[PDB]
Amino acid sequence: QCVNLQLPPAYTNSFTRGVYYPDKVFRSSVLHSTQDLFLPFFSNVTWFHADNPVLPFNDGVYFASIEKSNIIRGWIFGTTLDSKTQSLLIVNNATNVVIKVCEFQFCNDPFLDVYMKSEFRVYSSANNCTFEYVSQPFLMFKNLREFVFKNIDGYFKIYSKHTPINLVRDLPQGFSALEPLVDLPIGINITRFQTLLALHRAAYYVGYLQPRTFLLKYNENGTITDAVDCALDPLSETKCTLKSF
């Protein structure tokens, strides 16, 4: 059962945020140059309050949230977002993450209805399902949860990082790389997406990835501690050319 429940955008500065491990190869004590879809440094990221519009997916999405009450539960990814095409639904409940790809007929304004227990009010039907996956929760001071969503050659790739945050209303400064979470062999197009919130009877940020060249610094324990955006400015370009921070 669906229930029928526009402000200007706010912006924040993704200072040096949204960098993920480009592959699963171990490297240490080395500067590695790679080209991939990354969030540009110091970009203007759209700030929403958990206000739940349908957004473009473009070439991939950087999604971050700051909350202490688990309001954001999942995402809807697809094109038409109705029964005409296959759509990807990712939701997290108290014990498991449920991922399905079906011809969903989504509600005009989808959400989870929380009374402890909850009822899903996301879609009225789910026909011709092609993919299903179940595992441990993706989501489970304030908690900062960062995700990167890519869709390349039929594979929906998710990267994530979870840290404590002590800021009031913005993104933190400093470097933290996101690790691979899951790689789903789905084979569908994604052009638009929407966020699923838990509403009882928190804010998030959305940025977009670009084909950028990065210089990644791996420390002695094989983790990334810094990075240079080679197209940010003339100094960063010099640093990349000489492979030297």
Epitope: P8, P9, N44, T46, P53, V54, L55, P56, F57, N58, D59, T79, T80, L81, D82, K84, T191, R192, V206, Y208, Q210, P211
Partner: antibody, heavy 121, light 107 residues
Framework: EVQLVESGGGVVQPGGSLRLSCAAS????????MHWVRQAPGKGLEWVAF????????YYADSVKGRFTISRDNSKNTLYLQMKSLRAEDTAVYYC???????????????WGQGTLVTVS | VIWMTQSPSSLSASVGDRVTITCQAS??????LNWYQQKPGKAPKLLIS???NMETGVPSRFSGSGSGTDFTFTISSLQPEDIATYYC?????????FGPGTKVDFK
Amino acid sequence: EVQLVESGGGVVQPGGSLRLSCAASGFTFNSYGMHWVRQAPGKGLEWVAFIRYDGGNKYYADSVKGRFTISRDNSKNTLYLQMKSLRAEDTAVYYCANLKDSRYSGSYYDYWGQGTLVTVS
Amino acid sequence: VIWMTQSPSSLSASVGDRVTITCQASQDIRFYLNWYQQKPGKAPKLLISDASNMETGVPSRFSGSGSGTDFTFTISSLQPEDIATYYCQQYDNLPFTFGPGTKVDFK
């Protein structure tokens, strides 16, 4: 809240050039692709050009391809159209728009400006 | 290039009449058709997307359906405020195109 304002119209001579611009506000301009559409007096709508959100790929209608250039500056929330070798047949009202598109731009909302008149004579 | 056409080029109807407008494509464009309504002096307004999905704020008297190469736009009961030129647009492939436009007059 959402506005699109065209400017740079006016009267030019055949073989000349004119640079149009569109100021965007009230929405996340830097996340959306943008279109130019023109409408000659007494005629229907004609699609002119499309540019992706990152200012990367550019597409043109056959009738303007090779003469018109589409560009944007996401730091100024401004869309541009540079028209060279203008012909008498290019007389039209030019609109900037964010057209609803479930395949290419991923736009869920449809926005249009008021349009600016370009006359070639 | 996918070429679009519409029929009739113009029609006259009175208030309460049912009005149907046909849009066709030279190529199969599945369901990726937009319908616009333009009044003189104003920019076009989107009424229907994805062939049959109504835009928020659009009166329930408007509807549409179809797929492939043959689409229909319908007004179940024409109102005096519905006198406008209607255009169909395909966005299945670039370049995007608009149809000739169907002019609805007041009988």
